[PDB]
Subunit: 405 residues, 4 copies
């Protein structure tokens, strides 16, 4: 009926309001994430066919929104405008839990359904998909809430039907909103790239074990009987990894060989580098209690760590990477790679199927979403300021929207 509802409120189920509250970034306030976000009123986008409107109960936090709020080196608002967009703002957020509130044509999902979203859109009619491509790898794939405007930091969100998954009942709205992009991504890294998937007895090296990705990965690895070794930068983060089921941890502050690889011709430099990697390898042996290499290395740290990751992975093993926190130069020593027949695999979010499987595991209580802290809607900036300053807590964080839980 009405055009605008305050946070926590909604029109009659099955109907959409004309407007809504959402947290916007604008070019004029690019900068500190704490200054970048402001709550405004905006029009609610239309609910086209195959789509549904979700009453957003809580939204997750991530790195993407930090870079969006900075503007550098990519003005996402300006980028979209150069692609035909008329918005002079950006609504971020690429995780949510909520309630289907209205649906478009062709949709089978009924108003009232409780859902968690995988923030990936693709064209279900795309030729590569129709010929057997995994949609998240399709040419038409893009991250909702980051590459596309009108993400989850909004009272309502329009999504495609295939993007929805059943909210695990036992979870709070906040916890149900914090895990999907992080957990699903880790799940794909570990179980999505046959034949290099974690098996019982497999040692796994997990960079940033106390982080969002790593928190889920440690659990996933221990769950199927693998042996998780975590990399941390503090004793407390180490203990947290032990809480999650880690065999043990390695403190990266012990080493100084991190970074780009020298010219493989620079013999002196390489030997010096090798000493660093071997020392790291020793620690790994000491944590594991045996002289084995990780069959799989979970990467995302990128430039500083990739050369070590390549060295560490077992013969016929895999380094699988979904990001580049410390930079995008992945320097590979090809001798390690080809002679031992190792795999460096790029990975990015997850498939619908994988989103569903990890949701089931969490629903059943096998995996914990690791909700570390919940923020209010006016604290979206604060929360992203934490990440930016690398002051965020271990695990995953969330933001209440229409919910009180």
């Amino acid at each position: 009926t009405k055009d605008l509802y305050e946070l926590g409120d909604a029109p009659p189920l099955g109907t959409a309001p004309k407007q809504m509250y959402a947290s916007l970034i604008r070019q004029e306030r690019y900068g500190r994430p704490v200054d970048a976000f402001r709550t405004e009123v905006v029009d609610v986008p239309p609910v086209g066919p195959g789509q549904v409107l979700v009453k957003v109960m809580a939204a997750g936090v991530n790195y993407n929104n930090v870079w969006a709020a900075l503007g550098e080196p990519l003005d996402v608002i300006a980028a979209r405008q150069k692609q035909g967009a008329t918005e002079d703002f950006h609504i971020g957020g690429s995780d949510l839990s909520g309630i289907v509130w209205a649906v478009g044509d062709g949709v089978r999902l009924k108003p009232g359904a409780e859902v968690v979203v995988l923030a990936c859109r693709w064209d279900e009619s795309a030729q590569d998909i129709r010929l057997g491509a995994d949609p998240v790898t399709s040419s038409t794939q893009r991250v909702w809430g980051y590459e596309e405007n009108y993400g989850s930091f909004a009272q309502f969100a329009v999504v495609d039907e295939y993007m929805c998954h059943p909210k695990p009942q036992r979870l709070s709205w906040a916890a149900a909103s914090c895990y999907m992009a992080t957990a699903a991504t880790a799940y794909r890294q570990l179980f999505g790239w046959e034949p290099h998937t974690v098996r019982p007895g497999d040692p796994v090296l997990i960079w940033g074990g106390a982080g969002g990705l790593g928190s889920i990965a440690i659990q996933l690895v221990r769950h199927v009987g693998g042996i998780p070794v975590a990399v941390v930068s503090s004793e407390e983060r180490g203990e947290f990894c032990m809480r999650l089921g880690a065999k043990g941890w390695i403190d990266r502050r012990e080493f100084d060989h991190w970074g780009r690889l020298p010219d493989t011709t620079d013999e002196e430099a390489m030997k010096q580098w090798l000493d660093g990697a071997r020392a790291f390898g020793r620690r790994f042996w000491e944590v594991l209690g045996e002289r084995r290499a990780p069959r799989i290395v979970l990467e995302h740290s990128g430039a500083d760590t990739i050369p070590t990751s390549i060295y560490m992975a077992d013969n016929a093993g895999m380094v699988v990477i979904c990001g580049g926190t410390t930079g995008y130069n992945g320097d590979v020593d090809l001798r390690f790679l080809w002679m031992r027949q190792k795999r460096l695999q790029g990975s990015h979010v997850a498939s619908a199927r994988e989103a569903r499987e990890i949701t089931r595991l969490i629903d059943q209580g096998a995996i914990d979403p690791c909700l570390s802290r919940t923020f209010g809607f006016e604290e979206i900036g604060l929360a992203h300021q934490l990440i930016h300053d690398n002051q965020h807590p271990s695990g995953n964080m969330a933001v209440l929207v229409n919910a009180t839980e």
Copy 2:
């Protein structure tokens, strides 16, 4: 009966001589490959259990022997001595065709059998193999004739039984000896790494198409209905690739972006680099006749070419590499790798199964071993001098031993 037979001759079938002619490298004559090899008399190693003695009819040529003959940067003779070896020489060669002449205990292979060898040894009792590892990827794997002494540049060779494959009848001894390490390696690159194996309609980028690896790869790709695009450095090498079934070719001399990747932070440098890679990508489009990316990139060229290879491979595609001709720094732009979910796969020689399958294809006449030139036994040095000076002909080369064909 007798202790020594001249080249072309042999004791009674089923028996081993005490000595033999072979082509040796010695530390005192490390250097120019043409000076490095000399024919000498040496003791014939014992034929232990599981092993067989082969009367060597012809032996193949490769890069390994060139580096062995140079001594730098790895004194293979000194290396082996530090591992307990008593030889003060090195007999190279990692390809042969020949006749089983005597067999050890447990061997089912009968004297008289005509064989081609895959020059890879491993421990059939190794725990990783017994637990399902692919033997060529095992911790106990090593290249016979390069990492191990007493290779194929000898009148007789002792090999393990599992190393033998039926010589294709229709082939000369020279042709049957030239293909295995090269063809089998290319076959594994293209068909050994599911799910990234060449399918009908798949475009494939093949570096060094006119070389040994590339010659086989072009044929293999066209055979299963794929679309081979070759990279060459001359018009004549381009035409040769067309002879083999290539859609077309790209001349690498057209470009100057080759080499290590700049810091991904060096924006100017990267854009300049990207211009180079995009120009290369244009040529590829023009050869293919359509705007598609290679699903698989066959690599081996290494440092100069890997960044381009990474850029070129399709979403969810694979770059598979078995060497580093131009250097061992494989610089990866992680954004290309993770966002498009690409695979960089190390590959090294082949499995027994793969050696057999490519042998069958050649036996049936589907694939040509591309024997380019045959040398006499005293020309082993000359032939390796050619490779060293990059003056060798397209395709694969061989050396007569006991044979006249």
Copy 3:
């Protein structure tokens, strides 16, 4: 513009007529296929979104239409009516070549495009598909032209976009229309069920080698270097299989153990049965020239042949079956199946991807569609009468519609 065009004619490109000529079955004339089909005028169905209208140039022939024309044991017209259909007729045909003539909304395919169709429809929005199911295996899958009315025996046909594949240029309209369901189905059987796909050196047993399925299968197997052994019921059909690249053939008339398996408790009966299967196995050895079992058995013959097929398949081999010509009781001796760890795989038509790959192979001239005979539009009945009476020629047959080639 106009409402009706005679065969061979069409409205302006991009437009649809209101009516068309098509060949109908009606309940009142169920029976002999030669009496069952009659050419009538009918309304042209609407071209909804995602769909396109095709000017049908030629249509393929198959078993399905024979059973449709008989009415027994399934009145397809009555069946559909019980599912809400208002038609009192049935237009069959599940293969066509033709020209896109008009398109619905969301379609990227342009009028003028020449296409071959895979006669399988599914719901691209189905949850099982979205969660990673192969669409042809989906709960919403069905054969266009058989389970659905308005198949290809019509001047125009409405299809879904994903159903279209590029017509191979070098083919006549008749040849381009005859192969898809048959070739694609065989292709899936042989290459669609990893890890049991044909590899170089693999012997393959192919029932009905001179038929449509078998004609393509023999070629596909020989193409990747496998060894095709064909089963036929006549010397001439044997020679035809030799034409296609078969190693040799087996004459099934030599044996009398065909049919359902006796109770495995009936020792006498089973030994008698085993004698039959062993004799068949001997012939297979004699054709192959060695004592090996087929790694893959291409089935479709069904009840009479399945017990033999199960016995014949190699340890860890596969029997893959897409039909039951002689009946639907597939009697398995579980001892053969479990002790040798064999796979009995059901298979049905093909995926879009597989339709495309086999089309590419045919386009490139690696595979011949084996067009055996072409009929005129008024001979649809005659052609199906042949199949019914088992008097049809080897290979695949087609029917001209708007075309003269």
Copy 4:
């Protein structure tokens, strides 16, 4: 030193006695398992190369020994004699836990090592294995203790090195001896046949859930997040399945359609049969709480149950079977199999790798071996008499040999 040691005793570690106590079957006492076994003194077989002598601490029980003790329909003693064996007795047992006591040449395993054995032997030099065959599927594979004499019902046992796996520390000798053939076999059924392996959210139908196979399977399925539905013949067996993590159970006594399939031509019979299978399918829906089919059906029951299993499995699902308790006629309705593209997979024991993985899961406490009852060495007959009379308890049973735990 000495030639014979009483049960519980042994020569100096590293040495073998000339004789030993073992439980023998002899032809003269074929019949009731309780009469068939008698403890005698026998020579200890030699410890050839690659082999090790194990001081047997406990041995597992199974079906095989029951059929061995009956003699019908296969005189295993006479069979072996016709293959050249000189023994006039048979020592059964195909599971053990124990201590490596002496080793042959080439063995790396050291005296003192605690081991569990996978009772499968194969020729590590076999050509099919060397060309990539899974050894348990090899032509040279056979079950130690059943197809071969001198199994585990003996004070000492000679095994091949590859057959040994680390005993899980936390287990009693009895528990460590009872699980391997049963657990490993179930593990292969569920995780060994890609792409049909249990995934999170997968419903799985498990015949005989309270038995040895089923006990492990229920746990394995629930462990990876699947949904186990058990088939039992009593309320108490149902509750036991609930103990193991089952969603629920089905009572097979409710149905009477069990057995061989009628002729698919016998319409009346088939409809009657279908009513039975649909009723079974209803119960499955009611247990699951939703209208889904099992993605995987764990079979072994055989003739009575296979037709139902085939009907039940999901589109593109798998029925995997490792036995035929109720008979060896696996009657398949091919229409269900091909139209829904289902897989009927034979499976038999396990690979070394799989034995190791399930051992790791049990070692870590994720899976319980379900030791139901332990017998003394003179009760081997009694225990097998139970199985024979179908009076054995749920789970797995074991027999003490040299151990008191």
